[PDB]
Amino acid sequence: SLANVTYITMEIFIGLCAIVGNVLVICVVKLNPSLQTTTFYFIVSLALADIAVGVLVMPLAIVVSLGITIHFYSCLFMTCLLLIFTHASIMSLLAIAVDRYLRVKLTVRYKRVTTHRRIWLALGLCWLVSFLVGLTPMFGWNMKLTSEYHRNVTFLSCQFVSVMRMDYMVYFSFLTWIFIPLVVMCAIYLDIFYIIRNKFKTAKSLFLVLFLFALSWLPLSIINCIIYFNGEVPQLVLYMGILLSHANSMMNPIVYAYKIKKFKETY
Template structure:
C-alpha cells in the first residue's frame, strides 16, 4: 500500500482500525447529541441527575469529535514537535477523566437522593449541580495536563534528536508509570471503587425501604421503585464504562510491569476500540432503560420528519407534575 509523505505505510490491521474508529465516532456524536437535545426539549428531564448526564454526553461527543480523530492521527505516525504530540495525547486523557468524574458525580447525586430524600432538593440545587460539573471539568484538565508539567518521556532515547521532530505516538511521549500509578490506580480504580460502594449502598437502602411496604405510603413505595429503576440504569452505565476501559489499562500495566511481554497490535487496537465504543453505548442505555428519555427521542424523530406527531408539544401530558418534583419515570 502506498503512503503519503511523512506517514508510515499502512498495514491491513491499521486500515481496519481507522474504519471502525470512524464508524464509532459518527454513532457516538449522533447518539450523544440526541441525549443533550432530549434534555433541552423535555422539561421533565431537566433535573440535577440529567445535568451530570449531559456533562457525560458532552464528554462522549468530544470523544467522537476530538479523541477518535486524534487517536487516528497518532496511529498514522506523523512527525511533529515533542510537546505538540504530548499535548494531543493529554487531550485524550482529559476527556477520559471528565467521563469518569461525571459518572462519580451521578453516583453521589443518586446516593444523596435515596439517603436524604426529604432534604435532597434543598441540598442538591441546579446551581450547585452546575458548579459540580464545572469542577469535574476543571479537575479533568488539571490531571490530564500533568505530563505537560514534566512527567513525560522528553528525555527518553530518540526524543532529543537534533531535528526536534519525533514520530508522534502515544507511548513515545507518555510515561507508563504516569499511566499506571497516577491515571489508572489513582483516577480510574479509586473512583470506580467509590462508585461501586455508592451503588451497593443505594440498592441496600432502596431494598430496605421497599421491604417496609406495610409502613410506607403508596407514594413512598412508588418513589423508591422509580429510584431503583433509574439506579439500575445508571449502574449499568458504570459497569459498561469499567468493561470498556479496563482492557486498555490492563495492557498498560502489562507493558509497565512486564516489558518483556509484547502486546500484539491487533489486541492493542481492540482495547482502544473498546474504550471508544463506550461513548456510543451510553445513549442506547438511556433510550432502552429510561421511559421518559425514550419517549422524548421518539418525539424528536417525529419532529425531524420521520412521522408527523399528533401532539403539539414535545412533553407528553402528565409530565408537568413530574417536572415540578424533578422526577423521571424510568
C-alpha cells in the same frame, strides 16, 4: 497495516455513533424544558464529554496511530486531548454515581442542598479535574524527563509509546482517576442495591452501568499494566482496548439517558 486499517475504520464507526447519539441527548433536554431537571445536568455533562470523545478524541486517536512527523509537544497536546475528554467522561460517570448516592443517602433533603449552583460547581470541578489530569504530561510528566535522550528530540513520529509515560498511565491515569472512582462507583452501586432491597429488575440496572464502565476502561488499563511490568501485548488486542475505551462514549445514551422514562418517551 491490515489491522491499522480495520482499527481506523472502526474508530469512525464508534465515533459517528458517539456524536449522533449524544447530540440527540442534548437536543431532547433543550427542546423539552421539563427535562431540564437536576437529573439531566449530569447526563448533559456526560453527553458533552462523549461528544468531545467523538470530535476531539476519535480524529486524534487516528493521528497518534498514523505516526505523522510533528513536534513532541504538538504530539503531546494531541495525546493530552485524548486523556482530557476521556477522563471527563469517567468523572461524569462518577458524578452520576455520586448524584445517585445522594438520592439514596440525603433522602428528603436531596433537592434542597443540591441546588443548581452547587451542581455546576461539582460538574465544573469534574471538568476542571479532567483538564488537570489530562494536562499533567504538559507540566513535566512527559517522556522528556525520563532520559537525557528525549530532551533534544524534536519532530519525532507521533506515537503514544514515544511521547507518553507509563508512570502517568498506570499510577495517575488508572490507579488514581479510574480505579479509585470504580471502587467508589462499586461502593455506591452496592450500597444503592442494599437499600432498594431493604426498601432482578433493579440489579440489572445497577450492574449494567457498572459492568460497561469495567468493560470499557479495565481492558485498556490492564494492557498498560502488563507493559509497565516488562510484559508484552499483541497490537490487535491493544487496538480493541482503545476501541473499547471510546465505546463507552457511544453506549452512554442507551444505558443512562434511555433508562429514564421521560427521556425514552420523547425518543
